[PDB]
Design a protein around this ligand. Structure first.
Ligand code: SAH
Lengths: 265, 265
């Protein structure tokens, strides 16, 4: 007689918290969605094995349109869990699902898990210096999203870093790479011409955070735009003005050009 | 030859990930630091019991001054773990420790865990709308730091939310409460008169994130400044203009007054 929103973490089934695992193991029914993000290091089977329960996977439509018809009814007389990649309430609209739970008379609890939003700390960039975030969405038809460009501009002007979540089309198995994101940004630049994103812009790419050997790379767009960062998921970051210690880390750990060590105070 | 940076998560001994626990159990030596923050819902003893390894606690000086003399030597010929509250490398000073490892010829890997930086998603506020973050420091003597006030001003005027980490005297285990933080901000306002923080400002308090029963409250300073939010730790957020969905969550889940639907959206 309760609904748990449990995050599964960044990369594989072991990124779930012990708390989340112990609770999931005792739930009567377990649901999950895998369209908000990509866990490149595991499979449904491995997750099912770990929690020792059958997992019913829901599609975006099942959730957004029928969460209260598929999940909530069972949570009224059973302990139910709803699993999601990363943290269930980060860069998703799942928070609203707690309201549906309330109105249906179902108490809900949230169990957090490692999120890419904080995992970016592994790039060596100070977390507090990250400003507003944005998502680079695939253009479709005659529609070419550009809001993310303005976010970079606004943050950069304040000396803040910009985290760019990359698009995902789970049902089509399409995961935007940092390369594709850079290509899109260069096109927006040509259009708006704000000097925000060019071949000389310093960027940082983090691929498969959560794995033991994620790809962490820093350098100029002109040099990284055609580099292989390995399998998805990928995230792209456009740093603002760097502290010397941030630059040192990018050079030593992310292989950035040693010239960035010479910051322009 | 290997050093593992392992996050302990948000609140108690079960907030570590399954991955972190299993790796920690297999390490020859386990170190930990509790100066960047504390784990309020557990004890060193309960953490040791779960990991089944003796844990050597390091002070800020041990790490900042002697990390390469205390931890790295053992990591040269053994598998060593370095536990930290939250997500490793969110704390600004942690990143450079990976450079020390490199310099010492020691491999290092990061095992993530939930961080309050991403856990604030439980407030219903969209993660992408959070801007620069800041820490409210206790004033003392003739020193009255106020940079955090400016951070709120710059975020808010851009329509962004501001995450305020509250001061903590780790060694002394003393936590700044959201109440104390509100009183401080009102004092700074009286001095700067920027119209940034007043009795009419809408704030959100998140207490004991990670716990199954965190306190999540939203309302105007005039009404929350003397409210009891429960045991530490406390986090204070000053949201910017709200999306209606954010507001409805604050009302339905955080007990915010209906007034926010018309005044703060
Ligand atoms: N392990 C990982 N490595 C790199 N990027 C990741 C990632 N996990 C998620 N992302 C990024 O974030 C996007 C999903 S947004 C959903 C995020 C999730 N709730 C969380 O807490 O992490 C992906 O398309 C990708 O750009």
């Amino acid at each position: 007689m309760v609904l748990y929103f449990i995050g599964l973490g960044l990369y594989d089934e072991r990124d779930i918290t012990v708390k989340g695992l112990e609770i999931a193991k005792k739930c009567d029914y377990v649901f999950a969605e895998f369209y908000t993000s990509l866990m490149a290091g595991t499979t449904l089977g491995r997750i099912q094995k770990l929690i020792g329960k059958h997992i019913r996977v829901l599609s975006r439509e099942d959730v957004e349109l029928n969460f209260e018809n598929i999940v909530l009814p069972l949570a009224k007389e059973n302990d139910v869990a709803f699993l999601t990649p990363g943290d269930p309430l980060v860069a998703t609209t799942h928070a609203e699902l707690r309201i549906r739970a309330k109105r249906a008379g179902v108490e809900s609890y949230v169990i957090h898990a490692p999120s890419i939003y904080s995992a970016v700390g592994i790039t060596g960039l100070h977390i507090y210096k990250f400003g507003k975030s944005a998502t680079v969405a695939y253009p479709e038809g005659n529609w070419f999203p550009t809001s993310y460009y303005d976010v970079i501009k606004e943050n950069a002007e304040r000396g803040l870093h910009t985290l760019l979540f990359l698009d995902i089309k789970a049902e089509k198995r399409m995961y935007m790479t940092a390369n594709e994101a850079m290509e899109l940004l260069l096109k927006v630049e040509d259009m708006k011409k704000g000097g925000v994103f060019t071949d000389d812009t310093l960027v940082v790419v983090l691929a498969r955070a959560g794995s033991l050997n994620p790809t962490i790379r820093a350098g100029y767009v002109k040099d990284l735009i055609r580099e292989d960062f390995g399998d998805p998921p990928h995230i792209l970051i456009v740093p603002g003005k760097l502290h010397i210690v941030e630059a040192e880390y990018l050079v030593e750990i992310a292989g950035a050009p040693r010239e960035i060590l010479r910051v322009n105070v």
